[PDB]
Design a protein around this nucleic acid. Structure first.
Ligand SMILES: [K+]
Ligand SMILES: [K+]
Ligand SMILES: [K+]
Ligand SMILES: [K+]
Ligand SMILES: [K+]
Ligand SMILES: [K+]
Ligand SMILES: [K+]
Ligand SMILES: [K+]
Ligand SMILES: [K+]
Ligand SMILES: [K+]
Ligand SMILES: [Mg+2]
Ligand SMILES: [Mg+2]
Ligand SMILES: [Mg+2]
Ligand SMILES: [Mg+2]
Ligand SMILES: [Mg+2]
Ligand SMILES: [Mg+2]
Ligand SMILES: [Mg+2]
Ligand SMILES: [Mg+2]
Ligand SMILES: [Mg+2]
Lengths: 159, 167, 300
RNA sequence: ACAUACGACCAUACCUAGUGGAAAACUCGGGAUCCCGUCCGCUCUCCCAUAGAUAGGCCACUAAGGGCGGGGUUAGUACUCAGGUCGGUGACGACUGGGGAAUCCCCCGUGUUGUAUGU
RNA sequence: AGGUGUCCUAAGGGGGGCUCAUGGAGAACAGAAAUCUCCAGUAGAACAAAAGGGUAAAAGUCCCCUUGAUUUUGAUUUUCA
RNA sequence: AAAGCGAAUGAUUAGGGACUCGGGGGCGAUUUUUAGCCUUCAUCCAUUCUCAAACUUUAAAUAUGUAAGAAGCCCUUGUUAC
């Protein structure tokens, strides 16, 4: 049985970067969170209270509780042949709102106006994404862009 | 030049390093207390060397500082004993200087046989008006390059005011 | 010789501090505890009463904090006391009490709670706190703010607590204890409640006048030059401030005009742009180097 | 546009040296009765806004300045995922379908901005 | 390559002021090394102990007041069935 | 992984410039710090040849967390001891 402590193996993960020590920006304490938000976890080494375990560093979850100085988050952990639901308490210095769902929240309101604009006008539109398609036919002119002929080069010693 | 670039005496501090504790230190404190009129301050020993016979955290010295007209008159008396002659190397690169004497009764203190005889050290600090910039608590900053004193200026000031000689 | 500490490698690894800490203006350790609010209360603001002192002025504000900067809710300077009968001693304890009272009335009027929450109206040196007022058979809690003192020392008798005492009598609720007011005896832990009354109306200045005039007439007239030119004596200061107090609680939005030059916003911009020097260009900067080479080369 | 108070990003803002600063502001500044604190009214605290000066703090400009920030070159190179009854005694290497860096060196730049009150 | 079966009424809790290791230049005895003064100084010091992380108007250092090292039970995290 | 050391911490080869009061040896009277004439190590400065599982300013490939709607989006306004 090897050594297995709470913070074993976190030499580089929990460290602050080069030229990024000292004071914490105060906009961290001014954000607001609501039950149902989507946040990601990133441990700050300079705060030793409300720290999450090293497994959750770099994960994304959903808020389920709000208290005076922390939030409760729900994450799913894989243990061999199943998933288990975990609930962790994290101080707000370690959490951050996520941009994972912003693309979806932007397409939903853009689809609403395009649908209503088209319905008012009378011409149908697409309203869903498509993967990149193969290119089409086109003509390329040789005028004042004459091609340059290349050939492989002989071997030579550099040093 | 500008009226705000005139030299003056910031403070004068004198210390006596007896090297041991006991009655000798107490009597070394009385001479400074009588001379200045203020209560002096004891200084302990940071190191511990058996060659000098001192250990950590035992008082071995006494000092005190004065400002204003009191500093000027006491500085005058010491220069009188030194008969207004000083060495060039007594002046530092920041614009200060100092000297010392081997006997405290030379100034004239009505010698008492029950207090012994001590020597002391003289050191005074020069300055200019507007030095509060680097000393205030709020918006503390750094004095400019053209506003600081040099060795040539302070020796010249000493020769004009006290009419002394430095070589 | 010795190693040069400040070489290029020293500069490369150097990490600067926050800009307003380099300027020495804000204490970020205290600021965090002042502005942060419980996440249980989602968007309820926290109101700060900041007070700052200059050589010739007193600055007072009511502030809230946002993500991209602070927002000012009201302001009340000390030079604005001129249009109330006060012209001297603009940075003393009595002026601090008056300019604090001005902001409290100016804030309550903006919120619409001026008719209720009057305050004290008879400045007395007692220790009281603003209570809830009963209206239409119901209670309403008073407006609440906290003091922000900056880098000043909080010793007994400081002028920062003078501004607070005025705002508290103005009608705002500001939590505090009385062990920092002038006239508090730390030995018996009692407040005299009369020395504080003297300080509210500026009585400590007046007693200085009469004592100084009796024992040193030359210093008296050199330090109170502008006080005597307007026939202000030691028996008139108390009624002078009490007059300003009741005028302030009748029209807190009175306008003041100074004797400095007056222009418009567009006029000032045109004036300032004339005294402005522009940076060189690349061609000019290169031509200067070429000229410098010719000078040094021909200098030999 | 300029100044002050409270800020946001936290060096394009830092460090060194040299020249300038309309108006107002900010500053240095003057005095220790009271509140208060020191070995010392140096710092902190109180009183005056008259007198003096932009000397310094503060703002702006300069320097083939050190650092910092952005880009080029290094280079389709080093490395790496998948493949073959491929080469070679081996060490190790080439090819097929893909992904793809970092110094030395060269060029440019030297803060942006929110609320409130004023010049 | 190393560590543990302890140690602390403060080396626990709150508040306030200050800045460290080291270098240069100066001062009677005093010198390589005693005490005093100025300038530079991104932490090169200190934080009971092994090593790693963290900290500059502090988490270091000195000063003032105290016992949240207290009461009643539940939820959650690591090793994990 | 690769890369770096005219970048911090460590390891490491060689010349040059500045220096004397740091040391050593000496030569003009060893006179003498007279830094007189040299001299070698030492120190500082700009360069120079090689390195790191328990070093690092930088930094891949392969792998890895979350999302891609009806239990969604928008307008108005009812309860509470928070
Ligand atoms: K192990
Ligand atoms: K100036
Ligand atoms: K100037
Ligand atoms: K032990
Ligand atoms: K304690
Ligand atoms: K450590
Ligand atoms: K357990
Ligand atoms: K590299
Ligand atoms: K190295
Ligand atoms: K991904
Ligand atoms: Mg392990
Ligand atoms: Mg703990
Ligand atoms: Mg504080
Ligand atoms: Mg440059
Ligand atoms: Mg392969
Ligand atoms: Mg096969
Ligand atoms: Mg403590
Ligand atoms: Mg502290
Ligand atoms: Mg490698």
């Amino acid at each position: 049985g090897h050594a297995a402590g709470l913070r074993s193996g976190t030499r580089y993960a929990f460290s602050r970067g080069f030229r990024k020590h000292g004071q914490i920006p105060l906009s961290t304490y001014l954000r607001t969170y609501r039950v149902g938000d989507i946040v990601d976890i990133k441990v700050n080494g300079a705060v030793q209270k409300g720290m999450p375990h090293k497994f959750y560093h770099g994960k994304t979850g959903v808020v389920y509780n709000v208290t005076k100085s922390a939030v409760g988050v729900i994450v799913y952990k894989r243990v061999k042949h199943r998933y288990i639901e975990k609930r962790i308490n994290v101080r707000i210095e370690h959490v951050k709102p996520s941009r994972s769902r912003e693309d979806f929240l932007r397409r939903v309101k853009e689809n609403a106006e395009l649908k209503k604009k088209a319905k008012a006008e009378g011409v149908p539109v697409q309203l869903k994404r498509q993967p990149a398609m193969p290119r089409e036919a086109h003509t390329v002119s040789i005028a004042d862009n004459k091609p340059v002929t290349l050939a492989p080069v002989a071997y030579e010693t550099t040093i | 030049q500008n009226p705000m670039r005139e030299l003056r005496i910031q403070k004068l501090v004198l210390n006596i390093s007896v090297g041991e504790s006991g009655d000798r230190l107490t009597r070394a404190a009385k001479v400074l207390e009588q001379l200045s009129g203020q209560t002096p301050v004891y200084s302990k020993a940071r190191y511990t060397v058996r060659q000098f016979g001192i250990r950590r955290n035992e008082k071995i010295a006494v000092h005190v500082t004065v400002r204003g007209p009191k500093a000027e008159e006491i500085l005058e008396r010491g220069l009188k004993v030194k008969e207004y002659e000083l060495r060039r190397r007594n002046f530092s690169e920041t614009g200060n200087f100092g000297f010392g004497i081997s006997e405290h009764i030379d100034l004239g203190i009505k010698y008492d046989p029950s207090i012994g005889i001590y020597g002391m050290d003289f050191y005074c600090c020069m300055t200019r008006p507007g030095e509060r910039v680097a000393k205030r608590r709020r918006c503390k900053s750094r004095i400019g390059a053209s506003h600081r004193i040099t060795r040539e200026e302070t020796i010249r000031w000493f020769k004009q005011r006290f009419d002394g000689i430095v070589r | 010789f010795h190693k040069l500490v400040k070489n290029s490698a020293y500069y490369s690894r150097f990490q600067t501090k926050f800009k307003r800490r380099r300027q020495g203006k804000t204490d970020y350790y205290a600021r965090k505890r002042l502005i942060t609010q419980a996440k249980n209360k989602y968007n309820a603001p926290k109101y700060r009463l900041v007070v700052r002192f200059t050589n010739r002025d007193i600055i007072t504000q009511m502030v809230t904090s946002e993500i991209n900067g602070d927002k000012i809710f009201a302001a009340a300077y000390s030079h604005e006391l001129r249009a109330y009968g006060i012209n001297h001693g603009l940075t003393n304890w009595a002026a601090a009490y008056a300019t604090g009272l001005l902001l409290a009335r100016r804030v309550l009027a903006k919120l619409g709670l001026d008719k209720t929450f009057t305050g004290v109206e008879e400045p007395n040196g007692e220790y009281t706190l603003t209570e809830a007022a009963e209206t239409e058979d119901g209670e309403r809690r008073p407006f609440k703010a906290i003091l922000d003192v900056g880098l000043a020392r909080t010793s007994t008798g400081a002028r920062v607590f003078g501004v607070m005492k005025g705002a508290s009598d103005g009608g705002i609720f500001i939590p505090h204890s009385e062990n920092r007011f002038p006239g508090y005896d730390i030995e018996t832990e009692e407040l005299d409640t009369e020395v504080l009354k003297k300080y509210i109306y500026g009585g400590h200045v007046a007693e200085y006048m009469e004592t100084l005039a009796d024992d040193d007439e030359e210093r008296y007239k050199s330090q109170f030059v502008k006080y005597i030119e307007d026939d202000v004596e030691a028996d008139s200061l108390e009624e002078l401030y009490a007059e300003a107090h009741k005028q302030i609680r009748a029209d807190p939005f009175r306008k003041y005009v100074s004797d400095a030059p007056k222009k418009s916003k567009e006029e000032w911009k045109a004036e300032s742009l004339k005294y402005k020097k522009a940076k060189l260009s690349r061609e000019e900067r290169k031509a200067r180097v070429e000229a410098k080479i010719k000078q040094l080369l021909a200098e030999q």
